Amino acid sequence: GRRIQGQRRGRGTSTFRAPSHRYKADLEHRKVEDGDVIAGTVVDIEHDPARSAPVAAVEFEDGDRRLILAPEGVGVGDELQVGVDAEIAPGNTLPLAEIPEGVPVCNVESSPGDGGKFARASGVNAQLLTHDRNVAVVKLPSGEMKRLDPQCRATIGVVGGGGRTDKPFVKAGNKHHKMKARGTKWPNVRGVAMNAVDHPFGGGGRQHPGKPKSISRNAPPGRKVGDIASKRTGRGG
RNA sequence: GGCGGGGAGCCAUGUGGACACGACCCGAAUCCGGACGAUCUACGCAUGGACAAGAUGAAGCGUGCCGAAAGGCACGUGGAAGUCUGUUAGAGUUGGUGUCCUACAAUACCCUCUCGUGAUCUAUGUGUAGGGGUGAAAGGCCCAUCGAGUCCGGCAACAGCUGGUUCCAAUCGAAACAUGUCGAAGCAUGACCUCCGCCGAGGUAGUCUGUGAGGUAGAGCGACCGAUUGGUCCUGUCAAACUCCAAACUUACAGACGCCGUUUGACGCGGGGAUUCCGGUGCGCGGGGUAAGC
RNA sequence: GGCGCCCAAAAUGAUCGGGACUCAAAUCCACCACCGAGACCUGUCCGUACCACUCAUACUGGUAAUCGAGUAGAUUGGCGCUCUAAUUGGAUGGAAGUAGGGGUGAAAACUCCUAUGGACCGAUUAGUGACGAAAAUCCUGGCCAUAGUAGCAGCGAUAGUCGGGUGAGAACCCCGACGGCCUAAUGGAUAAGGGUUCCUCAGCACUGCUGAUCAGCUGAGGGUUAGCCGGUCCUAAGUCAUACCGCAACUCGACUAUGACGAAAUGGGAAACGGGUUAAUAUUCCCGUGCCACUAUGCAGUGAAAGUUGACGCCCUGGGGUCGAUCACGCUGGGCAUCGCCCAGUCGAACCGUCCAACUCCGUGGAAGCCGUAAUGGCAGGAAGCGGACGAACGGCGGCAUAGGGAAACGUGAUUCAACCUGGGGCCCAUGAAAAGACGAGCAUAGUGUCCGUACCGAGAACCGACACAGGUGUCCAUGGCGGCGAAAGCCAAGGCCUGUCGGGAGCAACCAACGUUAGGGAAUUCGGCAAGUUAGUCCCGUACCUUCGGAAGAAGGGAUGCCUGCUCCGGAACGGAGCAGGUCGCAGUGACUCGGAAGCUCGGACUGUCUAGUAACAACAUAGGUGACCGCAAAUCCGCAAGGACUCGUACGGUCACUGAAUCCUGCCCAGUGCAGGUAUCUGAACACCUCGUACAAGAGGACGAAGGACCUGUCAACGGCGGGGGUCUUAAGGUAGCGUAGUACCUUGCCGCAUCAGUAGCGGCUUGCAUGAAUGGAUUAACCAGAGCUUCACUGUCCCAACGUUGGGCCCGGUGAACUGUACAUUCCAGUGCGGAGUCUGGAGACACCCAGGGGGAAGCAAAGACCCUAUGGAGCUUUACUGCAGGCUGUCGCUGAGGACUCUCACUCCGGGAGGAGGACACCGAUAGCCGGGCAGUUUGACUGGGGCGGUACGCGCUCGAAAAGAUAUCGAGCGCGCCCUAUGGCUAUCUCAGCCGGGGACCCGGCGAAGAGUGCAAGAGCAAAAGAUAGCUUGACAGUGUUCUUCCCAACGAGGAACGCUGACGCGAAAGCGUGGUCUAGCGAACCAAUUAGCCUGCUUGAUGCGGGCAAUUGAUGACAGAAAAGCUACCCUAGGGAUAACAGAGUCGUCACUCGCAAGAGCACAUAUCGACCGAGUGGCUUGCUACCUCGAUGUCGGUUCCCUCCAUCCUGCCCGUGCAGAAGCGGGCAAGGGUGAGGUUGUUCGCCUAUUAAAGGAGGUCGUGAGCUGGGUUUAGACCGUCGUGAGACAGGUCGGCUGCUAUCUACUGGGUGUGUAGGUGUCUGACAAGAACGACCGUAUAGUACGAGAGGAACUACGGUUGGUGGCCACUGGUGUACCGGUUGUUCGAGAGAGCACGUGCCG
Ligand SMILES: [Cl-]
Ligand SMILES: [Cl-]
Ligand SMILES: [Cl-]
Ligand SMILES: [K+]
Ligand SMILES: [Mg+2]
Ligand SMILES: [Mg+2]
Ligand SMILES: [Mg+2]
Ligand SMILES: [Mg+2]
Ligand SMILES: [Mg+2]
Ligand SMILES: [Mg+2]
Ligand SMILES: [Mg+2]
Ligand SMILES: [Mg+2]
Ligand SMILES: [Mg+2]
Ligand SMILES: [Mg+2]
Ligand SMILES: [Mg+2]
Ligand SMILES: [Mg+2]
Ligand SMILES: [Mg+2]
Ligand SMILES: [Mg+2]
Ligand SMILES: [Mg+2]
Ligand SMILES: [Mg+2]
Ligand SMILES: [Mg+2]
Ligand SMILES: [Mg+2]
Ligand SMILES: [Mg+2]
Ligand SMILES: [Mg+2]
Ligand SMILES: [Mg+2]
Ligand SMILES: [Mg+2]
Ligand SMILES: [Mg+2]
Ligand SMILES: [Mg+2]
Ligand SMILES: [Mg+2]
Ligand SMILES: [Mg+2]
Ligand SMILES: [Mg+2]
Ligand SMILES: [Mg+2]
Ligand SMILES: [Mg+2]
Ligand SMILES: [Mg+2]
Ligand SMILES: [Mg+2]
Ligand SMILES: [Mg+2]
Ligand SMILES: [Mg+2]
Ligand SMILES: [Mg+2]
Ligand SMILES: [Mg+2]
Ligand SMILES: [Mg+2]
Ligand code: NA
Ligand code: NA
Ligand code: NA
Ligand code: NA
Ligand code: NA
Ligand code: NA
Ligand code: NA
Ligand code: NA
Ligand code: NA
Ligand SMILES: [Sr+2]
Ligand SMILES: [Sr+2]
Ligand SMILES: [Sr+2]
Ligand SMILES: [Sr+2]
Ligand SMILES: [Sr+2]
Ligand SMILES: [Sr+2]
Ligand SMILES: [Sr+2]
Ligand SMILES: [Sr+2]
Ligand SMILES: [Sr+2]
Ligand SMILES: [Sr+2]
Ligand SMILES: [Sr+2]
Ligand SMILES: [Sr+2]
Ligand SMILES: [Sr+2]
Ligand SMILES: [Sr+2]
Ligand SMILES: [Sr+2]
Ligand SMILES: [Sr+2]
Ligand SMILES: [Sr+2]
Ligand SMILES: [Sr+2]
Ligand SMILES: [Sr+2]
Ligand SMILES: [Sr+2]
Ligand SMILES: [Sr+2]
Ligand SMILES: [Sr+2]
């Protein structure tokens, strides 16, 4: 047959790439020599193309102007800080260790210094739970108990733009416009509506997959489609 | 039992034929390699551009009235919308199964028709390349080419299938069948045709007679077998898979006559070359089928 | 008994070949004479064979009654062509070749003569071959018919005409007049692309849809001038180069660095305007004026980099404001002349200076309800007011300008205001570039400002499309006037053009294209209202069901509409808008143009949107919404061989993988199979290492351990899918819940009832047993939407009844230009027949004087394309899968990397995070290697044959018997009957003893006797064999033995293996007295190659040699290929492709005739009695060729399918009409029958239908043939490609003799045929009138009514006829006084616009519209 769409994806052509040349900035945490002593002022609020969420532009003391992964509540004029001695207030960034247990955090690093990896989407947030001299347990937006190095930096608060999902797109056109800002090929043709040559579920006089949809995880790309390594399906039971 | 044994081979030239190779010539759909194509088109991206006029009148705001308030009602304001009308520009194409159909045109003309502020249309630039792209998915599109582009190369691909294969004459003259075969549109081996060499005296297409073989026609069944009538032993019927009988006829061998052979060498043996293995008709006998130019 | 007669019906024109024949030219019985082959006889010759002579196959003689045809094929002699050699010749006193002609040879061929030609050419012998053509849809070249034919018409752009100029020549080259065409283009400027097409002169052989003096053509010259217009500079998506790394390698490859590249209309950007000038350039040259950058010098200045700019989305909108347009008045010029109107102009840049609205801000002030807007809004955090700072135009004003331009005047105000400037508001799950540069940052003067582009076209002739192509092709001129909402129509300017480039004739016929108008009827037409039409702009009134409350809605329905006079209101006003009163014309006032027909029911998809470039726009795809799945990021998913990469400037409110498909109500039961996932005591589970055996080692055999996987268990269906049959459970887990239901799913089926219609296979409602509905394979339902499917109604109409007239362009004639298709030949046919069964060419007749014009297309199974359907090929390709075999990929173990102290700690490799310090991890992971599992993701293939085509079914695919099989042998079919693929240690072998089925008699056990050739038994089919046995019983025994052959069989004849049998020799045995019997069962079925393995007993052998291990071999046994003389092997294709086949199917033809239709014979029976008024069973005999079937003869290098339609001929088995007979005939009317084919046989409702059902009319509303007549005539509804849905089936691709929506119809007529028209010849200078062989007709068919007559007849009821009249209908020929239609002659009314008004006219498509 012919390669399925998920395989055309990998080659990374224009159709499947994200409009990077139109993206603003990775919002990785700023690096601090040490002893904290790093504060800045929120000069403006902007719209992050890549995330459909607002982001804040900060001017730090040493004259460095950078966009920051803004939590909900940051406003122009406000003063943010990044370092160990940072004051425990919304918008501030400090090691999971200096953060009191029970505080909502966002843009959590996976490895100290990586600049944040977890909880950066609209309205989401990780809940810090346990502390220690060896590990800091964080509860990620998926509800997973994550064990992190207490030296991993994070921001206090939840990410801006909460409830973005509450409103429906209503029309294809709206969907269209957002898709046009991500690395995603849209719209989607159901494989079962394709010719047998184009996809595992293609062909047949009437549309219906010609096999069970739950594919093994060791299935080769091109064959791995439908419900991947499903532990179960349906809602019943 | 098998193979071998009483000295003929080697080389050369012409010629018949076999096998591999392009293998008498042309003939088609492939498969593979390396290349050239996104000037068409599909999708994305960058930078630009286009959308008369009109209709409808969302939220929001206002005013008045009513209300304790929540708010309600009226009028106005406002100007939303993958909103409406629209040959504005522009995009498209439902029907005429109109015109054209050696065209104006290898997709055109006319009228009607659909879209026309958006998932819109559009110019240029740019990206994705062949088992790979691109695809709101029609196997659609990737330069009149797509269920795997184009060019050249492999390459003079292979075919048991169609077509064709060029001067005269003389001698003989088929097979359309049997056995085997992934065999039935093909082959091989036989049968049969022809050519060469060997052998050396008989041969046998006709008839008659003698010694044998036979159970078909017919006939018959108180001769088997199995069918098949009636009357109170007689009375009525049959047979591809019945036979107490039984031809014509066909056939083995021999003799006789005939014909034929011993310079035309028969009968027979060895070797070279085939073609051939879709047949048909009449007559006799058929088996199937109502029948048939079955 | 002979001949005949009845029985006896078929489609274009009858037949014995024809004529025709009657004491025959018939039939039969005898006879007589003749005609008639290549046969037979005869003369001569030839070939061949044989004989004699001979060296000879050279002569010569002889023989042939017993020689003389031939496809495929075998054998042999000869002709001709090229060049070589040897020998030997010819030619300028004329070679070869060619043309015409003579001679020879059976012939291939040889040779001569004459002409031409003008230089080479042979013969013999031996060689050499790119050695011979009628054919291949063969190749290349040339040429004819086609043909003076088609085209040079069709497009909303109908374009010309009269004079004249030039010229050898003028419809189309130029001037003028008159007449027209184009208005987002037919005008102006340009991008791409072209490349000199541009200008001039001179030309016309070429190019040009005709001509040409013209030209984008030919010849020769010439033409493009820049500091300030582009390029150049900057960076965009993105590209490349170098480095680095990968790769066997590179011209290859991703990342990361660096550099460079990447924008000519249309991204950013230092600076130029106005005028003049040329044949052709022009912000470039010239004149005037201006500006920018750099540099130099001088003065000033120390500021200089913070910041601003470059620099930005979509929607609404206010303010400033120019051009334009318009209004007012003045000036200059023009036009018109019943008036007094109408037109043009009235100019003047860059630049320099200056003015500033908005936004922002400051001072003052002091609002506690005021300020402000189109709107939002603003304020004690300080409103209005007042003053101030900053601050705009491509704009105003002054200069520029006794610059320029104008014949002249050389205006002033206003309104609406493109450009340009500056604000306010709203929107985003969407956030709307970057960089160079500029400003910030003065003034003088001077110098410098190079390089490249610059013509022209930019399109119905300069680009792409082969063309001077009706196609395609980017930007801007979007503000010219009237009009109107308008960038709409229509008309008209500026400007352009008559080149969407052949013309001339005919009231100009038929026919066609595109139109106009049609009385009455009004969808009757058709599959379907297809096509056309109806409606229409604007204002007022008014508006249903339903509904997601948005909508439905312009629902529907009704009314108004011009002009003129005078006014009112809103507004600052408009040359803006809304109204009032009075007057008044027309058939008609949105008068043209522009400009919806409307309503209801049902199906589908929610909606806008997408799609098959080129037959499908849809119900298909998408969508929001719903749901499930994977993943914590060192992730999931995906690309790469690798180096690396997309997702990702992303992080679960994410994004990957899938299903469903808006909203609303909902979404039942099943985990057995399959799939995925988790678990798992035990079982199973590979390699390395380890152990045992073996080997001086190794191969090898076995063991222990045991990863993932599997067995096992569990979870899961919004996973794949399933929810039946039986009874009051069974399979296979469950057994179909809510809904819905004859469905786009219901075969039966036009289901049954109802609605609607004259009549409804339709549609809708209900019922509903659902052949075979059903819940995210989503169910039900649904407002809105729709070029989606079906139905109904109102309105309207030439769709139709039924056609007519007209308009424009063709057609026809003439000048000029000038193809193609097609062509074996011949060809004036027709009716029959024949023939490979579908003939212009054969046979028999008939007809036929030749040639030409026009026509519509009957035939040439017309032309076009080596049929695409179907089958066949040990063909191809795409697709599928639990087909065969493999390859990636993932998971998992193990070895290496890899280190220290069955489980653990550590650090030092290695990995990741961090800028770094260091942090996290860690001998794991990554990487390399290997092993097990998963693995249509991918590759290569296979998937047989037979067959009354193929498939399905079956096997007649290997064997045995009877019959078929025709008395030797052999012998076919999907022929008839039926078997074998074993079984048996005895059911084998021998010997002894004995005789069996069955029946009878005496005491179904047993005993005795009798009859008893064989009917018993003998393992199994069938046929055959057997009686002191081949059977039975008893006993004994292992010959069911080893070796090696002969012969036959397999395979008749006649080659072929395995297998089989009969018969020998040798060995060893058993039984018997012995002869002898035993090589399995009485005979014919019970079977299997090579390679490899195992096994049996000897022996041969392994590379210098010896030993050991482990191999190689001679003979044979066993293991299977049943497709059985042996491949390891599944499907789909309608997306298809190729080779071929009429070797084979689908249409039609042909044969047949069971089937079908019709007839006849007999006549049981019934018909109250009565066979025969009428009906008529059984059985029997036929005719037709209309149904169906069979066959496979014709056709696969094509004969288009059903139905309809239109138009022509025919048949009779007659439905009506005419004339008759019978009756269970009073009459009237029936019923049945006979002759008879002249004429007629119609309109409508469902359905594609044929057919049929139904309705009303009717004299009756018959059937059939013509390639199931009729597609080079129509239609395209059905069938039957490519798209899609449903049901059923299938794991899947996909299928269906099911349903459903959509889906293309080529061609210029050569011949023949006929309808009409001509020219010739014959008869044989003329005019006029006739004749009538033949030919055609339906020229006429049918009905109603009145008198007859309320009569005959009849109890009555009812109710005729002859004949004479009147009329209607269908058909036919003709005509135009009458009625009607047309009537782009004509006359009139009137809308818009242009000519100033008036008058009179043009355009609004071939009449603007109307009468
Ligand atoms: Cl999204
Ligand atoms: Cl000869
Ligand atoms: Cl405003
Ligand atoms: K055919
Ligand atoms: Mg969602
Ligand atoms: Mg989808
Ligand atoms: Mg599809
Ligand atoms: Mg398809
Ligand atoms: Mg597939
Ligand atoms: Mg579906
Ligand atoms: Mg489905
Ligand atoms: Mg309003
Ligand atoms: Mg010959
Ligand atoms: Mg001869
Ligand atoms: Mg007999
Ligand atoms: Mg010689
Ligand atoms: Mg030749
Ligand atoms: Mg002609
Ligand atoms: Mg010029
Ligand atoms: Mg032209
Ligand atoms: Mg009809
Ligand atoms: Mg007023
Ligand atoms: Mg229906
Ligand atoms: Mg739709
Ligand atoms: Mg199409
Ligand atoms: Mg969805
Ligand atoms: Mg369910
Ligand atoms: Mg294949
Ligand atoms: Mg495959
Ligand atoms: Mg192959
Ligand atoms: Mg025989
Ligand atoms: Mg064995
Ligand atoms: Mg065989
Ligand atoms: Mg045939
Ligand atoms: Mg053929
Ligand atoms: Mg008759
Ligand atoms: Mg027909
Ligand atoms: Mg025809
Ligand atoms: Mg046709
Ligand atoms: Mg035609
Ligand atoms: Na003899
Ligand atoms: Na012309
Ligand atoms: Na106007
Ligand atoms: Na299950
Ligand atoms: Na294919
Ligand atoms: Na027809
Ligand atoms: Na008649
Ligand atoms: Na009908
Ligand atoms: Na036909
Ligand atoms: Sr990051
Ligand atoms: Sr980083
Ligand atoms: Sr499928
Ligand atoms: Sr459930
Ligand atoms: Sr392009
Ligand atoms: Sr719209
Ligand atoms: Sr159509
Ligand atoms: Sr039309
Ligand atoms: Sr066409
Ligand atoms: Sr519209
Ligand atoms: Sr080739
Ligand atoms: Sr015989
Ligand atoms: Sr002869
Ligand atoms: Sr002969
Ligand atoms: Sr002969
Ligand atoms: Sr040749
Ligand atoms: Sr010619
Ligand atoms: Sr013309
Ligand atoms: Sr035309
Ligand atoms: Sr001339
Ligand atoms: Sr010119
Ligand atoms: Sr550049």
Ligand SMILES: [Sr+2]
């Ligand atoms: Sr530019």
Ligand SMILES: [Sr+2]
């Ligand atoms: Sr204004």
Ligand SMILES: [Sr+2]
């Ligand atoms: Sr120019």
Ligand SMILES: [Sr+2]
């Ligand atoms: Sr054009």
Ligand SMILES: [Sr+2]
């Ligand atoms: Sr003009």
Ligand SMILES: [Sr+2]
């Ligand atoms: Sr011309």
Ligand SMILES: [Sr+2]
């Ligand atoms: Sr008229």
Ligand SMILES: [Sr+2]
């Ligand atoms: Sr109708």
Ligand SMILES: [Sr+2]
């Ligand atoms: Sr009708």
Ligand SMILES: [Sr+2]
């Ligand atoms: Sr009205």
Ligand SMILES: [Sr+2]
């Ligand atoms: Sr729903």
Ligand SMILES: [Sr+2]
């Ligand atoms: Sr299960």
Ligand SMILES: [Sr+2]
């Ligand atoms: Sr014609």
Ligand SMILES: [Sr+2]
């Ligand atoms: Sr025997």
Ligand SMILES: [Sr+2]
């Ligand atoms: Sr199957």
Ligand SMILES: [Sr+2]
């Ligand atoms: Sr299909």
